Amino acid sequence: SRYSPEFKDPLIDKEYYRKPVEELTEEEKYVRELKKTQLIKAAPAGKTSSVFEDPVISKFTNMMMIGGNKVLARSLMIQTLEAVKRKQFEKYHAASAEEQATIERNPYTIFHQALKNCEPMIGLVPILKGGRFYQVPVPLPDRRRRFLAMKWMITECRDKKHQRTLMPEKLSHKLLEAFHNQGPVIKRKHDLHKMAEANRALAHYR
Amino acid sequence: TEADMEEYIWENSSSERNILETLLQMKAAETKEIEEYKKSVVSLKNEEENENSISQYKESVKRLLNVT
Amino acid sequence: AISRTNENDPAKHGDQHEGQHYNISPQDLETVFPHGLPPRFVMQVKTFSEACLMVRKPALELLHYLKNTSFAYPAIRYLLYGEKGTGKTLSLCHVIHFCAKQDWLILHIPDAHLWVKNCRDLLQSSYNKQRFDQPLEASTWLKNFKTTNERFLNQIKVQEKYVWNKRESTEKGSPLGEVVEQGITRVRNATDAVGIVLKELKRQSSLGMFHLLVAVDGINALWGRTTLKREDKSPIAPEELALVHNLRKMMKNDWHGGAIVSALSQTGSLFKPRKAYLPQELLGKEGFDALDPFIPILVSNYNPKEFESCIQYYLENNWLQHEKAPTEEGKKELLFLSNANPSLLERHCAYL
Amino acid sequence: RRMPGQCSVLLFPGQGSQVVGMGRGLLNYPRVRELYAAARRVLGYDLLELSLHGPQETLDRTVHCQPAIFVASLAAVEKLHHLQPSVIENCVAAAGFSVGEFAALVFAGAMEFAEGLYAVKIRAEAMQEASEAVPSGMLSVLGQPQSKFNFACLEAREHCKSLGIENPVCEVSNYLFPDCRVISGHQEALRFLQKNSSKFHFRRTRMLPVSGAFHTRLMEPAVEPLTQALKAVDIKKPLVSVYSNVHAHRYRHPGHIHKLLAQQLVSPVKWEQTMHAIYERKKGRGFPQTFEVGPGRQLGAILKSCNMQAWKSYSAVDVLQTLEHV
Numbered sequence: 027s028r029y030s031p032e033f034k035d036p037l038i039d040k041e042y043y044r045k046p047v048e049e050l051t052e053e054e055k056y057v058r059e060l061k062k063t064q065l066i067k068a069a070p071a072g073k074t075s076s077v078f079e080d081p082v083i084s085k086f087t088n089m090m091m092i093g094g095n096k097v098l099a100r101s102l103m104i105q106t107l108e109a110v111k112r113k114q115f116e117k118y119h120a121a122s123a124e125e126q127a128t129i130e131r132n133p134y135t136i137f138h139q140a141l142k143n144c145e146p147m148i149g150l151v152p153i154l155k156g157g158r159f160y161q162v163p164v165p166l167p168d169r170r171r172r173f174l175a176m177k178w179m180i181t182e183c184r185d186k187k188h189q190r191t192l193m194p195e196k197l198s199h200k201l202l203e204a205f206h207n208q209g210p211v212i213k214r215k216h217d218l219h220k221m222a223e224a225n226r227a228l229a230h231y232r
Numbered sequence: 233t234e235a236d237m238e239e240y241i242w243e244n245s246s247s248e249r250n251i252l253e254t255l256l257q258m259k260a261a262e263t264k265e266i267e268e269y270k271k272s273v274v275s276l277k278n279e280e281e282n283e284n285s286i287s288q289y290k291e292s293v294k295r296l297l298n299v300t
Numbered sequence: 301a302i303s304r305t306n307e308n309d310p311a312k313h314g315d316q317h318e319g320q321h322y323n324i325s326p327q328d329l330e331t332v333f334p335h336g337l338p339p340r341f342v343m344q345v346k347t348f349s350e351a352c353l354m355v356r357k358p359a360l361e362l363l364h365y366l367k368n369t370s371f372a373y374p375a376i377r378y379l380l381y382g383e384k385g386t387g388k389t390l391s392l393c394h395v396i397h398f399c400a401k402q403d404w405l406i407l408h409i410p411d412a413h414l415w416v417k418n419c420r421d422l423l424q425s426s427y428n429k430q431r432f433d434q435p436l437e438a439s440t441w442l443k444n445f446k447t448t449n450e451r452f453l454n455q456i457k458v459q460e461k462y463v464w465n466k467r468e469s470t471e472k473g474s475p476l477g478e479v480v481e482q483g484i485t486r487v488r489n490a491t492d493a494v495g496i497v498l499k500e501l502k503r504q505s506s507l508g509m510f511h512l513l514v515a516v517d518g519i520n521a522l523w524g525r526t527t528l529k530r531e532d533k534s535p536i537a538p539e540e541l542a543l544v545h546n547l548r549k550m551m552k553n554d555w556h557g558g559a560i561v562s563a564l565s566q567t568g569s570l571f572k573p574r575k576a577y578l579p580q581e582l583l584g585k586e587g588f589d590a591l592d593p594f595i596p597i598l599v600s601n602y603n604p605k606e607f608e609s610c611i612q613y614y615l616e617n618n619w620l621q622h623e624k625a626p627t628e629e630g631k632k633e634l635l636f637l638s639n640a641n642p643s644l645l646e647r648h649c650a651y652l
Numbered sequence: 653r654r655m656p657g658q659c660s661v662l663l664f665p666g667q668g669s670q671v672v673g674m675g676r677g678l679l680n681y682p683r684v685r686e687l688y689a690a691a692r693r694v695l696g697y698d699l700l701e702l703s704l705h706g707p708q709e710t711l712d713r714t715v716h717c718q719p720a721i722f723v724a725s726l727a728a729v730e731k732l733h734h735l736q737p738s739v740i741e742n743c744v745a746a747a748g749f750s751v752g753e754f755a756a757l758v759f760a761g762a763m764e765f766a767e768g769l770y771a772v773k774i775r776a777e778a779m780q781e782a783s784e785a786v787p788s789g790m791l792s793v794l795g796q797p798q799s800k801f802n803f804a805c806l807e808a809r810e811h812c813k814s815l816g817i818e819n820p821v822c823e824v825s826n827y828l829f830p831d832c833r834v835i836s837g838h839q840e841a842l843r844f845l846q847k848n849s850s851k852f853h854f855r856r857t858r859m860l861p862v863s864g865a866f867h868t869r870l871m872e873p874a875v876e877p878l879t880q881a882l883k884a885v886d887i888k889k890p891l892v893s894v895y896s897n898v899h900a901h902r903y904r905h906p907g908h909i910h911k912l913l914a915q916q917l918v919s920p921v922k923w924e925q926t927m928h929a930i931y932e933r934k935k936g937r938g939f940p941q942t943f944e945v946g947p948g949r950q951l952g953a954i955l956k957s958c959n960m961q962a963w964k965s966y967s968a969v970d971v972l973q974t975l976e977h978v
């Protein structure tokens with residue numbers, strides 16, 4: 027690492043600094059005064075104080091990256107968001123009067139809810155103790171399940187059984203399926219929660 | 233060779249021929265303006281092309297063609 | 301609705317309508333523009349279920365010129381130029397819609413760059429063995445030219461016998477539609493059928509039968525280079541193509557009774573840098589000489605009024621779903637990231 | 653000496669590339685009428701009419717397709733020479749598939765036109781007789797990595813042995829590109845392979861429209877005729893590097909083309925090895941121009957599968973139409 031241990035990571039939040047001094051607690055005041063002494067790393071290319079910044083979509087784009095090609099990954103992400111938006115508008119126009127109140131057109135809400143519908147709460151840890159291999163259930167941390175949702179979505183969208191269907195179209199269809207609790211990613215979550223239900227007895231091997 | 237030679241001669245050129253044909257046809261339908269137009273054309277053709285030069289060309293052509 | 305204008309007749313727009321969106325009816329959309337509109341504007345039409353065009357100063361100036369046009373003088377060449385994605389194509393479409401409502405004959409070339417690249421089926425013209433035909437590119441244009449001008453195809457009548465083949469010929473006095481049909485049925489005679497159409501329209505308009513509008517988008521392609529090759533892997537010049545050779549005759553102001561309107565475009569151009577946008581840089585010496593004399597008209601980025609009106613239109617169509625986009629900070633960020641460029645603003649608003 | 657990229661390699665097609673209308677687009681070009689007249693003189697029937705206007709069923713017969721392909725390939729050579737003299741001037745390698753080899757040698761100045769036609773005629777007639785002798789055929793199979801070819805040939809032979817025949821024949825007859833082969837032999841063995849593709853791990857199988865098993869020992873009876881036909885012919889030293897199919901290397905000395913050309917009749921075609929021997933080079937080195945002089949574009953797809961980079965600079969000579977009426 028080219029940074030000394032003294033260097034601290036930067037805090038890009040723009041409304042944090044605008045907090046009036048009256049609202050600051052003595053601990054927060056102490057922390058702010060401390061930060062003056064500390065060295066701060068250069069803010070990386072990426073996160074910005076932009077009001078349209080979304081860390082979850084940024085992480086998803088970084089996980090679709092191949093060979094550092096961020097332009098193409100972000101292109102695919104924006105194309106997916108546009109495709110989801112257009113499909114929702116198309117289904118909104120053709121809907122009855124009462125069905126137009128239950129159609130979400132914001133692609134960001136759809137993306138977040140679709141990823142949240144694929145998060146598993148319980149997973150397995152490969153453990154061989156008695157000369158034979160054993161799965162054991164464990165509670166997944168929130169970071170781990172958030173990662174697994176995205177990884178399952180990307181691996182499903184990279185499948186080869188989809189011949190010549192371009193990634194934005196595949197990803198929009200999978201996201202719209204998972205928004206409604208459907209599709210192979212929800213089935214993958216269910217086959218994990220069930221196959222960890224079949225192995226509750228091994229839970230004493232933790 | 234004309235390309236090697238470093239001048240756009242407005243005389244006996246396509247610009248002169250085109251403007252002459254246009255003015256003859258307008259007279260059938262029915263100067264300082266020609267001097268301004270040829271100045272603008274020669275500037276555009278020999279020196280660098282910028283927005284000010286393009287606007288000068290536009291004004292000269294409008295005045296010659298009776299567009300306001 | 302501060303971004304909309306109730307005045308949907310292009311003949312009555314003025315400087316007070318600058319920055320307001322006027323609506324094009326579905327019938328006008330299907331008749332006037334089978335091919336004209338930009339590919340990414342058709343998506344907006346399909347998703348919003350309406351085609352609304354802003355009234356801008358370039359189009360208003362070019363309409364003021366076409367309203368005061370003397371039909372006895374030779375046709376005046378207009379050239380729309382500007383930076384990429386600044387709205388010159390849609391200004392040209394505004395003018396085409398104005399002219400179609402006054403019973404002009406529209407000769408609309410949606411993109412001339414498609415005639416100088418990526419052509420499979422090249423043939424040698426039986427009419428002249430030194431030129432080449434493009435049946436797929438000519439028959440595609442003929443159907444939509446027929447669609448736009450269905451009314452006139454029977455009123456306009458040829459003035460010479462055209463011999464498609466020893467068996468088949470069009471007799472003098474036949475309606476023009478027949479020629480178009482011959483190009484739509486047999487693609488072998490598609491390219492020959494386009495030129496004849498041009499030859500008639502440039503002629504008869506002079507006689508005074510009708511007013512003709514020649515609207516060519518990406519006019520810079522006619523005097524540039526092609527990416528088409530012979531069977532000896534040698535390059536083909538633009539003048540060798542009958543479709544391009546017959547369209548240059550229409551750019552010359554050797555006829556009257558109409559106007560010639562054109563718009564430059566670096567998008568899809570061949571052998572041009574990304575930042576070249578001025579008339580000579582795109583046209584070339586040959587192109588500038590061919591169009592000289594011509595009236596250039598500049599298309600710029602949105603001024604604050606136009607930018608605010610475009611964002612109000614998008615908000616009125618509920619196209620900005622991010623909760624911060626309606627707020628003023630979101631508008632400042634949109635303005636900075638697009639710099640008021642219509643194309644960049646539209647692309648950024650597509651996924652918000 | 654010459655930088656790779658300004659030289660050229662000519663690829664001559666073979667059996668299965670015939671098409672009705674082949675020859676149109678070359679007829680007007682220089683010298684072609686004389687080639688077809690000589691072909692009429694040597695064969696005894698009109699190739700021109702059959703190729704330009706045929707039922708395609710007489711054109712698919714073995715006795716007719718091979719001379720037609722030979723003559724069309726050479727006519728394409730003259731067309732290319734007219735269009736691009738430099739490419740023919742800067743030619744480094746030449747290669748023919750099965751009968752196209754006879755064409756390549758003729759292009760390389762080792763044999764003369766009439767000699768080549770006589771050899772090809774005798775070859776085609778003998779091959780047709782041999783195919784008539786015993787039922788047989790060929791199958792194109794595209795495999796996946798888990799596919800074993802000699803293994804599948806072994807059970808293909810076991811099945812026909814169980815049925816009962818003297819020495820059942822089923823072996824790889826053409827190596828085309830990675831995991832794509834053509835097996836040749838008795839129809840029952842090939843039907844066994846077709847119906848047991850799943851066990852044999854064959855992604856695709858397609859029976860070739862051919863009369864019989866080419867490039868196997870089943871064509872032994874045809875070897876002795878061709879040899880006689882080739883005995884009189886005095887083969888000279890090729891002017892360009894013309895590659896063989898038996899072992900896929902450049903012919904060294906003309907005294908061995910005599911037997912290698914007859915050995916090709918009963919040996920597998922080493923096409924993939926030839927493509928490697930012509931186009932293998934280190935990363936980054938440029939590739940020569942490639943011209944497929946003859947009907948069809950099959951060798952183009954084979955080259956695409958074998959070497960993509962070499963395929964980048966590939967072109968095919970149009971033998972069905974012409975852009976300019978010379």
Ligand SMILES: Nc1ncnc2c1ncn2[C@@H]1O[C@H](COP(=O)(O)OP(=O)(O)OP(=O)(O)O)[C@@H](O)[C@H]1O
Nearest residue numbers: 338341353354385386387388389390567642643646
């Ligand atoms: N007058 C207008 N009304 C509404 N939208 C417009 C207008 N002008 C431009 N736009 C927006 O800009 C986008 C691109 O505009 P347009 O196709 O006219 O660009 P252009 O200036 O011709 O550029 P290019 O060099 O790409 O051809 C349109 O899809 C539309 O989103």
Ligand SMILES: Nc1nc2c(ncn2[C@@H]2O[C@H](COP(=O)(O)OP(=O)(O)O)[C@@H](O)[C@H]2O)c(=O)[nH]1
Nearest residue numbers: 427461462463464489491492495496499542546
């Ligand atoms: N099939 C056919 N096409 C014609 C005939 N006459 C003109 N054309 C076509 O219509 C176009 C008319 O343009 P023209 O003035 O003749 O240009 P030019 O003759 O090449 O110098 C030509 O490009 C021809 O392709 C004709 O008698 N038969």
Ligand SMILES: [Mg+2]
Nearest residue numbers: 388389564565
């Ligand atoms: Mg445009």
